[PDB]
Write a protein that binds this ligand. Sequence first.
Ligand SMILES: [Cl-]
Length: 538
Amino acid sequence: FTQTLQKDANASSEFYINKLGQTQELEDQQTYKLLAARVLIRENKVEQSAALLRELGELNDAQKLDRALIEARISAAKNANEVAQNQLRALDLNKLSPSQKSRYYETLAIVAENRKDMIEAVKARIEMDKNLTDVQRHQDNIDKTWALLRSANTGVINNASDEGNAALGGWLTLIKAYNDYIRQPVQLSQALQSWKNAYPNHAAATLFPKELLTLLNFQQTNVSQIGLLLPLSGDGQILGTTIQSGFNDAKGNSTIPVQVFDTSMNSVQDIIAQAKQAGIKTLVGPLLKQNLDVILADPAQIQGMDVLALNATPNSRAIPQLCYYGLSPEDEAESAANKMWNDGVRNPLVAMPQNDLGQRVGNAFNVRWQQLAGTDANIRYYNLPADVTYFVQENNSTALYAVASPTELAEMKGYLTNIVPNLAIYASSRASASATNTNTDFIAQMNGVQFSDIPFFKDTNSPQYQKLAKSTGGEYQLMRLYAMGADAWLLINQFNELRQVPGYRLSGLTGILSADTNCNVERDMTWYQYQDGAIVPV
Ligand SMILES: [Cl-]
């Protein structure tokens, strides 16, 4: 049974540990412990793997050989590169099975990657590939190899020879094509299609890297007419009208015809049917969450159409040719988690209103905080500003993120500074309004607080700002919606890049725009802090 070690381990570590109770044959026990230890690494559990190796008892030669492989991988994971390399070179490569050789070369690749030697890491993964048999493992190594090449600096790539190594030659041409043409994705598509015919026996010609799949058959954005879905009468009229103005101002003299569909006068399902009958293949909108959910209730309704929805809901998911562009507080909370991390905040307090909005935004913050910190944030819900008094204690260290009005946040800062006067406070754009941000007192009172908002608020002297501030009556909320409409024009004209070019970024009035894997539009916010009675960008 010891021969199992020479084969891929396809089960979970749990599965292998269970087999210990089912078996009382002492030699089989060690084998199962080695199998669990091996998998435990790929589950990113180095210490658990190391602990299990210490539980091993008497081992035959084959079991000792496999333990030494795992030990080398653990050393590589711990960045003990010299030790790991010495450990591998102490093994007899000719005694290893193909599966064991694949593990050997992956460890070598990790060592090289630790050392920032990308070409050497790629060469080790090329050797790993020769020994792999399973398709998913083939694909995973292809994707890791591509990621190594993408991280290499262009100088090393452009000067590297293939060394007579056909696999390396194909890889080098592929990354050069990417680096040379990613800015011209139509030309990159042509180069990638050529690459498949130039290296048809290359491993990646059959299993293309996942990051390149949308580029291989890229299609240029070519908008011919747009249907604009907004609430333009009744309730929500101000919202849609303002978004429409930003949209139309950005559109300027474009000859692209835009047909306007007032969602307050007709159901979205009828509107989409109308647009299809009229031959419209491009929609901007709808805005209201419930109207987006109509689309998501039967996504085939928009088959053949590119759609930039102006909201996102808990039901948003990867749907062909559908992208989601909202100004959600959930996404500002994510920007808050990132900022507080990079600010060096640890153990953050998150004060949310006690309502569904609070849960969603608090949950959004915590999800992101777990990613950056590997632990939970302290989310707490309030009904009144006063409630935050009991969120902190005298002997804390810590920092706060709050979603609340400018007045409510003012009151909060008063209650919290009596318990911890040096508390770093963070807030969302809901805390920034014109009346308060121009008052000498509110600005010295809120001195210290920093908040996220759109970059449009950087230049409060320019003409575009002055004109909009006047036309909106100084209401920051409406200025944000105007900017959203302008950015919607930007996005719909870069729709295929947004969908198909990984990492594509746009400078918008509402922030730096990019798209996640569901084509939800992410926004890199501007942060502002009150300083010397003045508001300065950070
Ligand atoms: Cl709508």
